[PDB]
Design a protein around this ligand. Structure first.
Ligand code: MF6
Lengths: 99, 104
């Protein structure tokens, strides 16, 4: 069992990790890597972007960079983009590799 | 100006919002809506997923057309350096402030 810092190194290597002390069942987090897209892709191709964002991009622009980030497979089976580490998650040492 | 609760209502309506008290300049946040995807598409047609996750989906749903995985809505930030951050989070000060404004 490991610290949050070790779990973050395993996430950057592509593993799934979880805390034993979480309330929800069968959950895990994983990392999604950075991506860089031409601005035309963003305005015409990328799904799930608001029109207001797309207009700002068109108005202010080569390439747009999406930073890497963490995600969660939740207890209900949903995927949450943008998982949050609580105070307890960050300071705990009950992290485990789950895949 | 507005409370975070009002900013959240405008985000759900498709607006861009920002706090006047943020340190970085020219920033804003926006909402990306929930989506529902077929599980076969998650295994081979979605970029930016690790193999370990694709393997998990393949093991727990299989080669299925009917089966779908729901991605919930979430907030994103256009940062000070121009990068886009999927999964913006609200600090204590963000949550309790009343200096929110609409930017678009
Ligand atoms: N000891 C604790 N300290 C700080 N916050 C805690 C907490 N216990 C629960 N919470 C939070 O309060 C809400 C309901 O919690 P739960 O639904 O019971 O969450 P859980 O299944 O334990 O998953 C854990 C994941 O949920 C998120 O934090 C939750 C979630 O916002 C965060 O991303 C975490 O990694």
């Amino acid at each position: 069992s490991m610290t949050f810092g070790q779990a973050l190194e395993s996430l950057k290597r592509g593993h799934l990790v979880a805390r034993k002390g979480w309330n929800g069942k069968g959950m895990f987090i994983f990392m999604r890597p950075e991506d860089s897209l031409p601005t035309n892709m963003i305005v015409n191709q990328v799904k799930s972007l608001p029109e207001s964002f797309k207009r700002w991009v068109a108005n202010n622009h080569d390439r747009i960079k999406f930073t890497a980030y963490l995600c969660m497979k939740a207890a209900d089976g949903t995927i949450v983009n943008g998982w949050l580490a609580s105070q307890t998650d960050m300071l705990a040492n009950d992290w485990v590799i789950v895949e």
